[PDB]
Amino acid sequence: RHSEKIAIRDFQVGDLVLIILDERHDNYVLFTVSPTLYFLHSESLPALDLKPGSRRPWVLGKVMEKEYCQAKKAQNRFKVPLGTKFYRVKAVSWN
């Protein structure tokens, strides 16, 4: 409980993270002070009780994996330009 504080950068396995809906990018992201987008991995949505697509505004999660990615087409599910680098993060519920 004392170690339950939300990480804000350099996300590591085991970090507590605040996962928030980002309407502009049509996806859940991690709250961060990084300039880089950290998207929630699509495989993590069911176990966080989240849905694809009135979506729940936030959940608290625990980081399981991080993956560095780059958009290869101008039209993509993350609504970022061609060449944008971003992360995908797998997370499970903090509870």
């Binding site: 990615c69 780059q70 958009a71």
Partner: peptide, 10 residues
Amino acid sequence: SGTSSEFEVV
């Protein structure tokens, strides 16, 4: 696919 067309791991 469409997904791996859109983005990749780097």
